Every structure is written in C-alpha cells, then in structure tokens.
Amino acid sequence: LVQHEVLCSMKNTYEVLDFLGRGTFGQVVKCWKRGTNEIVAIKILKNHPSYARQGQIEVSILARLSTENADEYNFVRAYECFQHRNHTCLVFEMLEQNLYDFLKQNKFSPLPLKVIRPILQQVATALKKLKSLGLIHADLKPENIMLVDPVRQPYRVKVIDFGSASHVSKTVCSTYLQSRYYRAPEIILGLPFCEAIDMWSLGCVIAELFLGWPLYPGALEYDQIRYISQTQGLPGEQLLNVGTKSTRFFCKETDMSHSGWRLKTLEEHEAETGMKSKEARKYIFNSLDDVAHVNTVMDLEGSDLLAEKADRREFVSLLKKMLLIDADLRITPAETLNHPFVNMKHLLDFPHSNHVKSCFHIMDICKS
Numbered sequence: 001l002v003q004h005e006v007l008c009s010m011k012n013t014y015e016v017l018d019f020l021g022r023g024t025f026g027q028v029v030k031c032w033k034r035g036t037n038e039i040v041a042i043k044i045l046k047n048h049p050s051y052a053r054q055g056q057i058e059v060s061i062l063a064r065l066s067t068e069n070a071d072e073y074n075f076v077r078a079y080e081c082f083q084h085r086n087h088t089c090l091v092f093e094m095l096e097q098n099l100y101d102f103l104k105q106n107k108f109s110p111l112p113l114k115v116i117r118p119i120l121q122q123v124a125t126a127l128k129k130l131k132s133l134g135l136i137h138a139d140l141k142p143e144n145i146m147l148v149d150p151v152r153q154p155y156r157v158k159v160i161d162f163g164s165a166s167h168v169s170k171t172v173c174s175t176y177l178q179s180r181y182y183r184a185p186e187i188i189l190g191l192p193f194c195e196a197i198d199m200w201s202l203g204c205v206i207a208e209l210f211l212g213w214p215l216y217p218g219a220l221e222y223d224q225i226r227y228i229s230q231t232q233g234l235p236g237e238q239l240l241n242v243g244t245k246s247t248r249f250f251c252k253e254t255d256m257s258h259s260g261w262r263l264k265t266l267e268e269h270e271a272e273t274g275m276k277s278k279e280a281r282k283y284i285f286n287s288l289d290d291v292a293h294v295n296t297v298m299d300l301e302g303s304d305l306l307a308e309k310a311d312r313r314e315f316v317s318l319l320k321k322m323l324l325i326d327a328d329l330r331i332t333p334a335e336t337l338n339h340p341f342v343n344m345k346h347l348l349d350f351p352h353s354n355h356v357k358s359c360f361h362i363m364d365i366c367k368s
C-alpha cells in the first residue's frame with residue numbers, strides 16, 4: 001500500500017502529507033486529522049498472512065500500554081487503530097526529531113553530560129514501566145528516541161518503536177532481534193534473554209551520546225562481540241557454554257594454559273567466512289574506565305572542572321553497570337534512577353559552582 005493524499009477511519013479520517021519512513025517494518029506516514037489542527041503519525045503494516053500475528057501482537061501490546069497509561073511515562077501516545085484497504089493502521093502523536101538526526105545535525109559533536117542526564121532519566125522511567133508490566137522493547141536505538149519539541153520543550157523525549165516488542169513469556173531466541181550496534185550479548189550469543197536486553201541498548205545509546213559515535217560500530221556480529229570483549233573483558237565461561245551461537249565466534253582452547261575459552265583470531269574468521277574485518281570504532285578502549293578521559297579539553301577552570309571530573313567518575317560507574325556482560329548482574333531501570341549520576345548526590349558537595357547550578361537547572365527545567 002501507498003498513496004499521496006487520502007485515508008479514513010471509524011470516528012476520524014486522515015489525509016497524508018509526506019512520507020516518514022519505508023522498509024521491512026511497513027510504512028509510516030505523516031497525516032493531518034481533518035477537522036482539527038493535529039498532525040499525526042500513522043504506520044501501515046503489509047497485508048500478508050505470514051506476518052499476521054506479528055501485527056496482532058503489536059496491537060495487543062499497544063492496547064495493554066494505552067491502558068496502564070504508558071502515556072506520561074515518557075512513551076509515545078497511541079490514539080486509535082483501524083484498517084484501510086485490508087492493511088492495518090496505527091495512529092500516533094507526532095514527535096519532531098530523533099536523537100540520530102540530532103547528532104547528525106551537530107556533525108556528531110559529543111553532547112555534554114549536563115544535557116545527557118534528563119534524557120536518561122526519562123528513558124529509564126519508560127523502561128521501568130515496561131518491567132512492571134512485563135514487556136521488552138527490543139529495538140531501543142538512537143533512531144527510536146525522539147524530542148517532543150526540541151525548541152519549546154528543550155529536553156522532553158519519548159520512545160517510538162514497537163515492531164520488536166514482546167512479552168517475557170519467550171525464553172528462546174531464534175534469530176536477530178535488535179539493531180546491531182545496540183544488540184545485547186544475550187542476543188549475539190544465543191541465551192534466554194530478559195528485559196535486560198534493552199538496558200544494554202541504553203548503555204550504547206548514552207555512550208553514543210557522550211562520545212558522539214557508536215560505542216561498538218561492529219560491521220558484523222563477530223566484529224561486535226570482538227569490540228565488546230576487547231574492551232570489557234571476555235564473556236564468562238558459563239555464558240559461552242550455553243550460548244547457541246557462541247561456537248560461531250569463540251573457540252574452546254583446551255591448551256595447557258586454558259580457562260576453557262578464547263576468542264577466534266581475525267585470521268581464523270577471515271579464513272572461515274572470507275570477509276576481511278575492517279576496524280570501525282572511531283573510539284578504541286582498553287577499559288570502560290578509559291571512557292572518562294575522552295574529549296578532555298573543557299574551557300572550565302576552578303570548581304567547575306572538579307565537578308566535571310566527578311561527574312565522569314560516576315558516569316563510567318553507571319555505564320559499566322549498564323554494560324555488564326552478564327544479563328542478571330546488569331543494573332535494572334529502578335536502580336539506575338537511583339544511581340548517583342541520575343540522583344546527583346555527588347553534585348551537592350559543590351556549593352555555588354556555576355557549572356553545578358546549571359546542571360540542576362536542567363533537571364528542574366525538564367518538568368516544564
């Protein structure tokens with residue numbers, strides 16, 4: 001389906017104005033709710049039977065989300081639902097700009113920590129509501145986080161993809177289910193995955209926002225887990241033993257000096273798959289603590305700088321806790337909202353610092 005100007009529904013009717021996206025997910029288009037001054041986004045799903053319950057499940061969760069009022073929990077609001085030419089449509093409120101196109105706007109300049117904080121706090125409260133209902137987003141990525149109104153509401157945001165969401169009843173992963181740069185280790189190796197899958201995605205997102213570039217811009221799933229263990233340490237023996245896909249990226253060295261597992265050398269991969277592995281990280285780290293020493297020229301002197309050095313110490317502290325290789329030990333939405341970095345406890349230790357007075361003024365301004 002596709003058209004340039006026309007549509008209708010049960011109580012409402014919509015005209016299309018411009019295209020907003022088109023791909024495997026279907027087709028999203030921006031429309032005008034005639035009779036009012038609302039512009040809405042409505043997403044059409046393709047009308048093929050093999051994709052039947054893939055659409056039935058997205059509506060089933062959208063309904064379970066309108067009830068329980070996910071709205072005002074920093075989620076996009078789903079207005080109504082209907083059909084048109086046998087296709088199925090979903091009406092959403094219109095948001096302005098997603099974080100990818102926002103980073104691209106500043107030529108991928110790093111965003112300062114003072115701005116990153118309110119965004120995280122909101123995306124955390126949105127995931128917190130998910131866990132309390134038992135849902136997994138599964139596609140949390142920069143493209144799926146948007147500024148309500150980046151000019152009239154400088155920092156409010158909301159989430160906006162559900163084509164990958166599912167209940168926690170699943171305990172098995174058959175194929176890929178995230179955007180690669182943000183796919184959690186559970187998906188890459190093949191283990192029973194939980195809602196932590198998204199908390200990983202949030203790790204690469206806030207990391208991407210601070211560095212200005214993907215933390216792990218792997219070209220293939222191999223490159224991905226290569227960058228990960230190379231930075232954070234090789235995964236744990238118990239994880240790799242029960243992973244289905246772990247034979248594809250790791251080898252079981254039974255050498256005299258073996259803990260049971262070693263990563264496959266590049267040469268072993270290029271000889272196996274035939275694909276030369278190009279380095280893709282704009283940033284290469286030996287440790288995650290190493291992240292605190294990046295983009296270090298600040299134009300701040302005096303107390304302003306010491307506060308910034310303490311803000312970074314607590315940033316890596318949380319990033320490490322969000323990016324635990326293990327799924328269970330990884331920090332949970334409720335616990336991140338309590339971590340000192342979102343809390344800002346460590347900032348109180350700094351009286352009359354004009355950099356700290358401006359950090360608090362960003363959290364308080366988030367409510368308005």
Ligand SMILES: CCN1CCN(Cc2ccc(Nc3ncc(F)c(-c4cc(F)c5nc(C)n(C(C)C)c5c4)n3)nc2)CC1
Nearest residue numbers: 019020021025028041043076092093094095096143160161
């Ligand atoms: C070539 C660039 N052109 C011009 C720039 N433009 C950027 C852009 C993107 C989105 C919006 N507005 C908006 N508001 C509310 C919504 F709910 C969705 C929404 C809902 C869904 F279910 C989706 N499922 C998927 C896969 N998407 C993707 C489209 C993210 C969904 C999006 N989108 N405004 C501008 C892109 C096209």
